Amino acid sequence: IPHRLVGKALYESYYDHFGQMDILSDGSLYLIYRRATEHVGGSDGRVVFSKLEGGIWSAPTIVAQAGGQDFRDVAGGTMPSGRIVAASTVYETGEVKVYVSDDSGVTWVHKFTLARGGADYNFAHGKSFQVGARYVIPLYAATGVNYELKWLESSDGGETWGEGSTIYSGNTPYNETSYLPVGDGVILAVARVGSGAGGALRQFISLDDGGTWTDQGNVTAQNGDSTDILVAPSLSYIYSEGGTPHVVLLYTNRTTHFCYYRTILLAKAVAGSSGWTERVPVYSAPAASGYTSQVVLGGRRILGNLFRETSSTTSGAYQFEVYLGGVPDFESDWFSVSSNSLYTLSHGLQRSPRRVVVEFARSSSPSTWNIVMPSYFNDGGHKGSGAQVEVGSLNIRLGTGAAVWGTGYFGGIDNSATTRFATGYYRVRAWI
Amino acid sequence: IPHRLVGKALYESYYDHFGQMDILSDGSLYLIYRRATEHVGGSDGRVVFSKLEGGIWSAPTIVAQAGGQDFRDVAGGTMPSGRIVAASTVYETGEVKVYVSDDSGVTWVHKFTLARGGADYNFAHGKSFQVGARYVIPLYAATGVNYELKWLESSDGGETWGEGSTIYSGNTPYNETSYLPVGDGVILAVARVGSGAGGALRQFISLDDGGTWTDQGNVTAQNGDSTDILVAPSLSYIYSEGGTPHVVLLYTNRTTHFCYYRTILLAKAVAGSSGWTERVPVYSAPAASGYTSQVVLGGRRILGNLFRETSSTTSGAYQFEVYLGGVPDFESDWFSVSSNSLYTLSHGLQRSPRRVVVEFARSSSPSTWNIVMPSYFNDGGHKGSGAQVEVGSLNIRLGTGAAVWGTGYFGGIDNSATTRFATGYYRVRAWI
Amino acid sequence: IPHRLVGKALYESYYDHFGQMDILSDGSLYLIYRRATEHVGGSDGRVVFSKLEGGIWSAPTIVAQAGGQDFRDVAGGTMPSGRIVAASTVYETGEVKVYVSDDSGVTWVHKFTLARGGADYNFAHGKSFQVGARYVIPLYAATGVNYELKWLESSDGGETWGEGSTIYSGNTPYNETSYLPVGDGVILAVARVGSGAGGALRQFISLDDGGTWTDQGNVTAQNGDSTDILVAPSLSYIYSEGGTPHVVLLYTNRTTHFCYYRTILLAKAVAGSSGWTERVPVYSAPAASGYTSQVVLGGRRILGNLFRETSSTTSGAYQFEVYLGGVPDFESDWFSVSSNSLYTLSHGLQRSPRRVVVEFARSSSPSTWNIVMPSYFNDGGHKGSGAQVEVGSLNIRLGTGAAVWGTGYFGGIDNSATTRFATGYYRVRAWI
């Protein structure tokens, strides 16, 4: 039952990549992934399964292998019954093949092959999930220069499968897409765009279990990822100490070479694609790294995996844990402030927040910031420094002094007349 | 597994009311309720079941209907076995009829009818619950001008039933009563009083699984509900990020037309009926609304339902979520404070609180309040403003300045000599 | 499902002691323990089981009794299957006898006896636990003046048993040892040393499910237990509101006569034996008290038991609950500070902490402390009092004023020139 993924890795100098971590009925973590000796298309990809036992990743079981065919990404995860699903596209044919296991990785059975039909290919990718009576494996497809996002579905526990809901069909090459039931009909999705270049991930939402979809635009935070290459998004659902739900997005930035997460209030995500929080690095991701996946414990505790290259032809799985702390129920942008002014922030909360923090920085993208508390200094006349705070059932209001921060009276960081700032930026956080 | 009830409703222009929301073994939420085309006694009430699937409340299954009889409130919920129980009083006969389902709302079986005996009637109402080996459906009864609160019990998983524990018997018409196992023998109860007029809900407690009961008096907070009509209380159990248990009370105020909750530390509730916190509105409740019920996830996350009228003859179920945030382990009343004084608050905590907030208002029923932090102003002489704080293993102590709040140095809310307050009110909150 | 252990006790004027509390499949708490009419070796110890039902500890079932033999400590707990295990050393023979129950305390079956072999004895003690496919009962042994810590293991669900991993073998009489899977191969252990005198408990860790062990030294906090008698340690695993794992250590101090807990970040515990937090008393422990054990709910909520003497020949089980609050993700020692200085604290956190508290005391072992916020006073010239704070992704930095705390302007606790402190101690806490 408890887990510890800090520092854990599966690495045997293969090219192990493109897979999913999930958890077995018996609480054991496992990985299903493509094991190969190259990444190039038409190389030696086989679908394999490894279980984490005693802190050691097991010698992998072969799920599916065919000379001379090349299995690509491995999609799947654990169904409600405890059956495991693994699905992978055969590079040579564009067909998706689906395997299941009822003994938890020991034996595998081929259940289904999806033919291309008129499509150039169907590409299986990502964590599979339950939607009502249906279990879903996400696919992306191209047909010349039309592109589609689709679900491959089973309503009988994996015995039979079929093309189902269609999420997108258009001229934009959306591909690797993570879907998160959030639920009672609501499904959120975040998609890689083409090569990933451009600094954007696309956000879609359905309110009817995949029946219909709205394109909500690009995932948007105050401080983005420039035009960086962004790939393989993955999503998790958590809720706070008092029941507030948030969505957590992991993604890999191949320009800065880091895997990051950001969060958003589910309420905001339902409303649109803006309101995501600041990026937090959870792992270095050199070169062609990572392809994240998560298991969540206690509605609170994210266990993660990505893949990382040690060279252009070798890679392994590296696990980690995400420590979210207490996610604010309300959080402002960094916003500009001036002296002797009044700032009024609608908090949008079900009750007045019992806790509030106000912080100060000299830009809206700071690397350091100060806690704002109402002080005083004297420069010839009497002056307040910082902010007083009023809380109520609608608003947080801030009243700034002659300086919005700083006094000159405190060592190192506030030790001269020059640290008395008449202007800058505040950020307000509030917790119910 | 995840749920989202924000904005959800079951409304088909019937008079749907007086029911319970609970959760099925498979994680599906459901409602059992009285569906009719009127509210008046002797109209067309039938007991019905609806399941929430894909974000859509299902066309209801008929649980029990009889021309020309009128089923009234629907009590019940999910037993430990996954069997569902629905019970309702027949208006014409005063008899309670009990139905169960073993396939989760699809089929229903009549298990029991309770005859009046010497009582004018037995009235089934509320969420049923497990007490040790017993499953309980709450009843209220009248016999002329004697009134009783009783439990209808089964010790064989719902196969057979019988009158059990008697909670109250006297001249006061206590009726709609919610019971919450809190547990190892401790059961809390909160009861509507007569019509509900008077602004009071009555609190009872047993320490022996219903064997004996103590009347603890009226539910009491610092700021009550005047003489308002208070109806249909319902209770939930949660525990904080570090294991502190609280009880959450939902109720409908038909004078202000809002459904509210308040909370109390379980430790306080065991000790008596005072110590409840401030009311928080979770839903408008026009006219003859609501009849709340809850499901709790992760010890933390309350999912709720009430019924609301759209007219005197039409009503629906409306769901919501409660965001408790981090409930304080210690919380004072608003209490009066003066300048240059020392306030000593026994926190009652198992260890010194790691976090403390002090807030200030000009009345003990404020709509806005300020965060108290030790500042300074000069009005001819040197003066502290606000409070310094000492924490220890017994007490929080506050030392007030020449002003208990205010300086005149901060925009909007603290911008004149007039905002330098020598007196007012403080509230202290503390979190372990 | 909910539990309430506040004030609960099992006491019948026997000498009831040396046992374990755990929880049954059906959510019922139970105790397995030695019931006797004396504590002396060779008296009348029998292994017994009691279940908590309706808030009342049941008349105990006899698990194992033999005239004229004396069962000593009772080790065990609940296996993953729901089978209960109870094991106890027979004083006269030094043999360990193992019993199981498949009906949850009603019937017991003897499964195994461990002969001494060359050992003076094997002594069963503590909460048993699962390690992968193995279930473990801890033993300590002596062979003249060699001492060993060992695991008695079953890999078939308790049907057969055998000596397994050896944790320690040497000249130091480590004995009562608690083991906590933390997991994926990581097991922490804390051990009583000999009689317990000396103020120390010893910390060991394995990273390979008991294959190998490292002695990490004495459990170390800033403020220890002098040379006190420390006995019967026991360990629990919890995780914070955002997934940060901590270990909680309970132990009994027979010099001060209190049962205490301390906590440590799992990350710190893996790194070594220092970093434990301050002791918190959870129960008086007169004379030869207590022998703690815990059940944890929701990753958050510790339910506890110890045994307490009412005289040299009578004792009972007393239960309690531990309220951890929000455990800091980072916490400094009390460290010395001076005026007009800059303190730089590496927080070690995955992201910048959203919340920080700074407190002040005049020693590094204070009984009271003050919250530090940047104020002002004038003693002829302008002076800051307290500290300003900078937060970033690596460090918390504090800048102190001319006084590190105090102004003379606030009633009771800060009301004279004498409370303007140029030096003292700060403690910083941070929560992600």
UniProtKB/TrEMBL annotation, chains A, B, C:
Native source species: Pseudomonas aeruginosa
Domain PA2794-like C-terminal: 330-431
UniProt-recorded name of the protein: exo-alpha-sialidase
Domain Sialidase: 37-229
Single biological process term from Gene Ontology: oligosaccharide catabolic process
Pfam families per the UniProt record, alphabetical: BNR_2 (PF13088), PA2794-like_C (PF22432)
GO cellular component terms, A-Z: cytoplasm; membrane
Taxonomy of the source species: Bacteria, Pseudomonadati, Pseudomonadota, Gammaproteobacteria, Pseudomonadales
Top-rank EC class of the record's enzyme: hydrolase
One Gene Ontology term of the molecular function aspect: exo-alpha-sialidase activity
Family named by the database record: Belongs to the glycosyl hydrolase 33 family.
